[PDB]
Structure formats: structure tokens, C-alpha cells
Design a protein around this ligand. Structure first.
Ligand code: HDD
Ligand code: HEB
Ligand code: HEB
Lengths: 330, 442
């Protein structure tokens, strides 16, 4: 295939790795004060993602950088049009960074409660606002002839039913993903508490993502987009089901398939376009008018093919080192 | 005030906050790795205590360094879309490589260092901290390659069809003389920061312990910091001299601000009418500040050597003056790094991508220039005001908590233990105050 198609697929892969790894991250963060109900339990829940959340954050960093290098026009238009939503994502991410890293610098209840507030904000805002952003990307934006979005007139238009439903769907999906992750990476009473809170998280995922995934597949997708949406819904159901059957390995795998399917749907229903225009006079961005040079794509392809597999290898080795399930002291 | 200057202020504030914390990481990850290697090979307990103490400081600094970093990468396209379009072909490659190699290495292996003490062999733990140090240096290199393309664009050709500078020589971009000169200098700046910090804290604690085995870690750590400070000062002098020679040729307007009228005339008669000079005051005082604060670090190093020779320890009012001098000298390299980068970015003005002087004749590369007014994403000013205020307040809170938390860790002092203990689950990465209230009782 062309290099443009290859780098569209690579950006989709980077965003899927992000939304997958940072997805359980946000699920663990959201469900820490919901499942914990206790300092010992909440600390173990946060400790599940402690050693590996920085790498998950990096995946986002690389998604942004590679979308800047492969598709500069896409990077500029998406990030300038969606200014304030991205600002909210970034503020919550900063607050989560400090809330997670500084959590153990002080052994005091006031410090821990402020850390919990930081973790709450940084685990709730990013899923919501990423769903908002990506639903608006798929629906379309007021893109002009110069590939520029006003972002002040476009902001009220962004607040629509499809974007709100996407936000809720992303939050529910990442909550289910983090729940399956907690089931996989904990032992003792914390795991049982996660099982106790499984029904509510599942129901919300099934009732919000399903409508959203089907709507996005049908209205703005292709003829097989409904097939992909059915796969996503079935993956969510299997993940919720495998959790009940104590298949915490298979539950996390199924919710993983669900998240990657959501990303694959959002990008395949977008391809070949990269930024659908809502203005008739304006021009939509695709993998050709919004792209880097062939030489730049060649250099990027070489470096990415050489380095990214090694990154995945040693990150997986780290996840293997920290494979042992955590326990909660009384 | 219009959106351009608000966006400039936001970028400046956010990334000045970021490089408040970057140099300490750049210098201290290597120093912590060195201290832990010493503990591994020599076996002495005081090296383990030094590892724990300065690794506590390192982890606090690394935390605030990551968040400010996150905003900078996105801020690029959020606030400077036209810039992000003109250069993303050639500028975005170094950013992608930085994230893919250096950020992944440092994040993954610092997670291992913080959490995987007994889960891996101790030599592999020291390898993890060494990898984090090397990865921080690599990230410095790739970021500096990107900024040096901004300062001195090479390896790019203008494409009139896309109206955009496009990558045509990857090797010329990576081995840009501006990048190859500015990278060692930023590394030596980070090392000066960390060495000054270690030296000041260790001298303060030597005096404090004398006034009050368990504190035996201060003198070896003091000498580690002393050697780091001296070597980094020499490296800074050499690399800054190299960069001065480069800046003479590539960016005559920067040094003329550190003649300005002749260069302004040539600029307006080559790129059209308009101001083409930086802020003379800010440039002048940043450059001088980038120097005087190094003078301060050297002063503290010399005084520490004078007072602490031959295992000596001051006992009079000299001891109190030495403690005060150490604590006062600690912020000097942070301010020096900030001043140097402020000089760089303000003297870059009014260009977000500077016109390469050698590229003037070449038509196929003469259009790689861009100004700051033409590179900003057009926003309603209330949005930029909102983001600037939010970032400034959040960063002020983070910096205040950071100072408080390092002060708490330092005041707690070195760990009583000299070797990791299965009980209390402590290791070379455990923070000093991890088992103490917000205000420790003693
Ligand atoms: C000379 C060194 C240097 C310079 C000039 C910069 N940085 Fe930086 N950055 C680092 C050196 C560094 C680091 C030292 O490697 C940090 C700080 C602490 C850390 O963990 O990594 C880092 C972290 C860091 C992170 C966190 C990613 C992660 O580790 O998870 C991001 C997203 C950025 N930076 C982005 C930037 C951007 C967009 C810059 C310019 C506009 C920039 N940095 C200037
Ligand atoms: C390339 C990459 C990069 C980098 C690395 C950097 C790094 C840095 N930086 Fe930068 N910037 C940039 C890119 C960049 N940058 C840009 C693009 C801009 C836009 C233009 C202007 O604003 O100037 C800025 C801008 C800017 C500013 C503002 C100025 C004006 O006026 O405008 C400042 C202050 C700064 C500082 C800084 C620092 C300190 C540092 C160290 C860390 N900054
Ligand atoms: C660390 C601390 C420090 C120090 C000490 C120093 C010291 C010094 N220095 Fe520096 N810088 C710095 C930090 C610093 N620094 C920085 C940060 C910067 C930015 C980046 C670069 O550039 O590289 C600079 C930069 C820089 C430059 C260039 C600028 C531009 O780029 O434009 C020069 C020329 C120099 C010189 C010098 C000298 C001569 C000295 C002696 C005094 N500096």
C-alpha cells in the first residue's frame, strides 16, 4: 500500500495502544474510590497501575508526536479546533500525574485525600473528553478552505448528542477495562470488591457504548462498520461475562478487544478522510492533502519499524516483571 | 492584548515551568545511578543512604517534569497551528523519535526502578536507573534537534505546492551543528543543577550533623556533588564557547542583543517591512543571568572545598555561614538554566523558524522562514486567557508543593538503615518520608 495508508494505520495503532493501556489506567483511577472504600484497598488499587502508567502516558505522547510528523495538517487542525476540550484533558492529566507519583511521598491522611482528589479528576476528565473529541472528529468539524477550524464558533456545535454519547461511552468502556484489569492484577478482598461492583460498570458500558458504537458505525461508517460495531458490543459482553465466570485473563482480553475495536471503528469509518469538514465551502482533510512528504514518511517508517517493536518488547517485559497480583493488608 | 502575545506568554510560562524541573532530572538521574553503583560495588552503607536520599529528591522532580512535558507537546498544535503545519514535516520527526525512544525508556525503566527492587537482580536495578539517566540525555538531544531546526533550519526544502518546508536530508537535521552544540551544553546544565543541589544539601547536613555512621553518607555524597559541579562547570564553559561561535554566524541578531541597527536594516530590506529584533533588555539580562548564576555555583563549590578539606568540619560562625551559603546556592543553577533558555527563545524572536543565513541565496530553501505572528493558531482571546491562567495557577500550586516536599525530605535527613530491609519494604528507591506525617515529629 501507499505510505499515507501505512501511517494512517500506524496512527490508529498508536491511539489504540494508548486507549487500551491508558484505558485500564483510567478505569483503575475511577474505580479506586468506588471499589476501595478503605485506605488499604484504594492504595492497592492505585498500586496496580503504579509501576506501569508512565509508559501508558508515553503511548499518548508518541501518538501525538507521530500524528505531528506523519500528518502535520491533521495535528494542527485537530488540536487548534478542539482547543478547550484538549486543555481540559491536559489539565486533568497534569493533576493525575502529580496525584499518582506524589501519592507515597507523605504518609498522612490529608495528603492521601488530596492525592485521591487529583486521581479522581485525572481519571474522570480524560475518558469523557477524549470521547467528546473523537466523536466530533468522526461526525465532522467546521473546516474551512485553509484547513482551519474557528474553535470559537465550532465549540457550541461540538456540544451535541453524538459527542456527549461518545464521551459517556468512552468513560463507561474505560471503566469496564479498568475493572477487568483490577480483577486480573489483584488478589484477596479487593478482587472480590471489584467483582461486587462489576454489574453497575458493565450495565453502563453496554447501555452507552452499544448505542454509540452502532450509531457511529451506521451514520458515519461503511457497509462493514455495523459488523465492527457488533464485534465491539460482543467483546464488551464477553468481557463482562468472562468476569462473572472468573476469567479475569479473558475478561481483560475481551475488553481489550472492545477498546481496540472502538479505535478501529473510529479510524476505519474515518479513512480515507482524516478530518471530515462540516462546511460545504471548506475542504475535508484526508491522508493526501493532510500528509507529510514521501521522504519524511520514509524516514519515519524506517525509524518506527526499527524501534517500536523493541519498545513493545521491553514494555511487555516490564508488564511481565510486575505480573504478580497485589494484596491488601487488613 | 491579542491572541499572539497571550499564546507566546502561555508557551513561555508552561515551558519555563517545565525546565525548572528538567535540569535536576538530567543531572540527578546519573548521580543517583552513580551512587547506587558505588553502593553495589563498594558495598558501603553510606552509599545506600545517599542513594535513597537523592533518589527521593529525584522521584519528586521526575513527577513534575512529566506533566509540564505533556502540555508542551500538545501546546504545539493547540496554539501554533500554522507553525505546526509549516514544519511538522521536518520538525515532527525528532519529536516522534524522542517519544518513541527516550520517553519510553525513561518512563518504563523508572517505573522499574521505583517498584522493581527485589523483583529483579540488583545489578539490573542499577541498570534501570542508568537507562533512565541515558534516556533523559537522549530526550534532551532530540528536543534540542527540533529546537535547533527552529533556530538554524537545515535538511529541509520549501515546497510551493504545499506551502510548507519538507524533510529532504535526515542526517543533516540530526547532525545540525546547532543541535550538536546545544545538546552537550544542556546536559552540562542539568549536571550543574544536580551537582550544586547535592553539594549544598550535603554541606548543610554535615554542619547540621556535627551540631547535633548514621550521617556518614554526607561527606562522600558531598564529594560526588563537588566533582559533578566542577566537571559540569568546565563542560558548560567549553560548550557555551562553542555555541557562542555558532551563534555568531547563524543568528547575528541574538549576539548583537547580548550592530543591531545594521542587522535590522538588512532584515527589513530582505524579508519586507517590520520589526525584526528581539527584546534587548530580556536578552541582555538573561544572558548575563545565565553566567552569574554559574558564578554562584562555582563560589559554593570553592567554599565547600576550602572548609571541608582533609575531613575537616567547621565549628564556628563559619559553619552557620556555610550552611546558609549552601542553601542559598541551590536555586542558582535552576535560575541559570531558565535564563539561558529564555535568552535562546527571546533572541529567536520574531521568528518561530529562523531564516538560515546560508539558505538566503538558495531559492529552493529560502522560504523556510516563518514569523511568530504568522505561525499562531487564530483563537478567540478568551480561550487563550483561560488556558494561560489555568496553567499558571496549576503550575504555581505544583511548584509550591514540590518545594515543600523536597524541603520535607531534606529535613528528615538520611535513612537510619544502611541496607534494604524486607521489613518496612525499603530499598534504594524508597522515599525518605514515605512513613512519616506531613510534618515529621522530629
Ligand atoms: C534538555 C532537556 C529538555 C528540553 C529542552 C525539553 N525537555 Fe521535555 N523532558 C525532558 C527533557 C527536556 C526530560 C528531562 O527528559 C524530561 C523531564 C523529566 C522527565 O521525566 O523527562 C522531559 C519530559 C517530557 C515529557 C514527559 C513524557 C514522559 O516521559 O512520559 C513530555 C511530553 C516532554 N518532555 C515534552 C517537551 C517539549 C514539548 C519540549 C519543548 C517544547 C521539551 N520537552 C523540552
Ligand atoms: C521546537 C521545540 C521547542 C523547544 C524544545 C523548546 C524549549 C524551550 N522553550 Fe520554547 N517555543 C517553541 C518550540 C520549542 N521551545 C515555539 C514553536 C514557540 C513559538 C514561537 C514563540 O513563541 O516565540 C516558542 C516560544 C517560547 C517562549 C516565548 C518567547 C516569546 O516571546 O515568544 C519562551 C519564553 C520559551 C522558553 C523555552 C525554554 C526555556 C525552553 C527550554 C525547555 N519558548
Ligand atoms: C546549566 C546552567 C548554565 C550555565 C551555567 C551556563 C554557562 C554559560 N553559557 Fe549557557 N545555556 C543554558 C544553561 C547554562 N549556561 C541553557 C539552558 C541554554 C539553552 C539551551 C541551549 O542553547 O543549549 C543555553 C544557551 C547558551 C548559549 C547559546 C544560546 C542560544 O542557543 O542561542 C550560549 C552562546 C551560551 C554561553 C555560555 C557561557 C559562556 C557560559 C559560561 C558563563 N549558553
Amino acid at each position: 500500500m501507499d505510505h499515507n495508508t501505512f501511517w494512517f494505520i500506524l496512527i490508529a495503532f498508536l491511539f489504540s495502544g494508548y486507549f487500551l493501556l491508558e484505558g485500564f489506567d483510567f478505569g483503575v483511577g475511577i474505580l479506586a474510590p468506588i471499589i476501595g472504600k478503605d485506605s488499604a484497598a484504594r492504595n492497592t488499587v492505585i498500586r496496580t497501575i503504579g509501576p506501569v502508567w508512565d509508559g501508558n502516558e508515553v503511548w499518548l505522547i508518541v501518538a501525538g508526536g507521530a500524528l505531528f510528523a506523519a500528518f502535520p495538517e491533521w495535528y494542527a487542525t485537530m488540536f487548534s479546533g478542539m482547543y478547550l476540550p484538549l486543555f481540559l484533558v491536559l489539565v486533568s492529566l497534569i493533576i493525575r500525574v502529580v496525584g499518582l507519583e506524589w501519592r507515597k511521598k507523605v504518609d498522612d491522611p490529608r495528603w492521601q485525600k488530596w492525592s485521591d482528589r487529583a486521581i479522581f479528576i485525572g481519571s474522570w476528565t480524560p475518558p469523557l473528553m477524549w470521547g467528546f473529541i473523537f466523536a466530533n472528529i468522526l461526525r465532522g468539524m467546521p473546516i474551512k478552505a485553509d484547513h482551519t477550524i474557528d474553535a470559537a464558533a465550532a465549540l457550541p456545535g461540538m456540544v451535541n448528542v453524538f459527542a456527549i454519547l461518545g464521551a459517556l461511552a468512552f468513560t463507561a468502556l474505560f471503566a469496564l477495562h479498568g475493572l477487568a484489569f483490577i480483577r486480573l492484577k489483584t488478589a484477596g478482598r479487593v478482587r472480590t470488591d471489584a467483582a461486587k461492583a462489576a454489574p453497575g460498570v458493565a450495565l453502563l458500558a453496554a447501555v452507552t457504548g452499544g448505542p454509540f458504537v452502532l450509531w457511529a458505525a451506521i451514520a458515519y461508517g461503511r457497509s462493514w462498520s455495523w459488523i465492527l460495531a457488533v464485534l465491539i458490543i460482543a467483546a464488551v459482553l464477553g468481557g463482562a461475562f468472562a468476569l462473572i465466570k472468573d476469567r479475569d485473563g479473558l475478561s481483560f482480553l475481551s475488553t481489550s478487544v472492545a477498546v481496540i475495536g472502538v479505535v478501529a471503528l473510529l479510524f476505519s469509518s474515518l479513512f480515507p478522510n482524516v478530518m471530515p469538514t462540516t462546511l460545504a465551502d471548506g475542504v475535508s482533510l484526508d491522508i493526501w492533502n493532510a500528509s507529510a512528504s514521501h521522504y519524511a514518511l520514509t524516514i519515519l517508517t524506517w525509524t518506527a519499524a526499527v524501534i517500536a517493536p523493541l519498545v513493545v518488547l521491553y514494555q511487555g517485559w516490564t508488564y511481565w516483571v510486575f505480573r504478580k497480583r497485589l494484596h491488601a493488608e487488613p | 492584548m491579542d491572541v499572539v502575545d497571550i499564546a507566546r506568554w502561555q508557551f513561555g510560562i508552561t515551558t519555563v515551568y517545565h525546565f525548572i524541573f528538567v535540569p535536576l532530572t538530567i543531572g540527578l538521574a546519573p548521580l543517583v545511578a552513580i551512587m547506587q553503583t558505588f553502593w553495589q560495588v563498594t558495598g558501603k552503607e553510606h552509599w545506600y543512604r545517599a542513594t535513597r536520599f537523592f533518589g527521593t529528591v529525584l522521584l519528586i522532580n521526575f513527577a513534575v517534569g512529566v506533566a509540564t512535558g505533556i502540555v508542551q507537546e500538545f501546546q504545539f498544535g493547540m496554539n501554533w497551528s500554522e507553525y505546526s503545519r509549516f514544519v511538522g514535516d521536518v520538525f515532527g520527526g525528532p519529536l516522534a523519535l524522542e517519544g518513541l525512544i527516550a520517553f519510553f525508556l525513561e518512563s518504563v525503566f523508572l517505573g522499574l526502578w521505583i517498584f522493581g527492587w527485589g523483583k529483579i537482580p540488583g545489578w539490573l536495578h542499577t541498570a534501570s536507573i542508568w537507562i533512565v539517566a541515558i534516556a533523559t540525555n537522549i530526550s534532551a538531544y532530540f528536543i534540542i534537534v527540533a529546537n535547533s531546526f527552529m533556530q538554524h533550519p537545515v535538511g529541509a526544502e520549501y515546497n510551493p505546492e504545499t506551502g510548507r518546508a519538507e524533510l529532504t536530508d535526515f542526517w543533516a537535521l540530526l547532525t545540525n551543528s546547532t543541535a550538536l552544540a546545544a545538546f552537550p551544553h544542556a546536559v552540562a546544565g542539568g549536571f550543574l543543577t544536580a551537582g550544586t543541589f547535592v553539594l549544598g544539601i550535603s554541606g548543610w547536613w554535615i554542619i547540621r550533623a556535627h551540631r547535633q555512621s548514621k550521617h556518614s553518607m554526607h561527606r562522600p555524597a558531598l564529594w560526588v556533588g563537588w566533582w559533578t559541579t566542577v566537571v559540569s562547570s568546565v563542560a558548560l564553559f567549553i560548550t557555551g564557547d562553542t555555541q557562542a561561535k555558532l551563534m555568531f554566524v547563524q543568528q547575528p541578531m541574538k549576539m548583537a542583543s547580548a550592530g543591531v541597527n545594521q542587522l535590522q536594516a538588512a532584515a527589513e530590506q530582505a524579508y519586507g517591512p517590520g520589526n525584526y529584533s528581539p527584546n534587548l533588555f530580556v536578552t541582555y539580562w538573561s544572558f548575563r543571568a545565565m553566567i552569574g548564576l554559574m558564578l554562584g555555583s562555582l563560589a559554593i563549590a570553592a567554599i565547600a572545598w576550602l572548609l571541608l578539606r582533609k575531613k575537616r568540619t567547621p565549628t564556628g560562625k563559619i559553619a552557620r555561614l556555610f550552611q546558609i551559603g549552601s542553601l542559598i546556592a541551590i536555586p542558582f543553577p535552576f535560575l541559570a538554566n531558565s535564563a539561558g533558555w529564555i535568552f535562546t527563545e527571546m533572541g529567536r524572536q520574531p521568528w518561530v523558524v529562523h531564516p538560515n543565513p546560508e539558505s538566503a541565496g538558495d531559492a529552493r530553501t529560502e522560504m523556510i522562514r516563518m514569523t511568530v505572528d504568522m505561525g499562531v493558531s487564530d483563537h478567540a482571546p478568551w480561550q487563550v486567557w483561560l488556558t494561560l491562567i489555568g496553567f499558571t495557577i496549576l503550575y504555581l500550586i505544583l511548584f509550591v508543593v514540590w518545594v515543600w516536599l523536597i524541603r520535607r525530605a531534606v529535613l528528615i535527613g538520611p535513612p537510619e538503615e544502611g541496607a534494604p530491609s524486607v521489613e518496612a519494604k525499603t530499598g534504594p528507591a524508597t522515599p525518605i518520608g514515605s512513613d512519616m506525617p506531613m510534618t515529621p515529629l522530629q
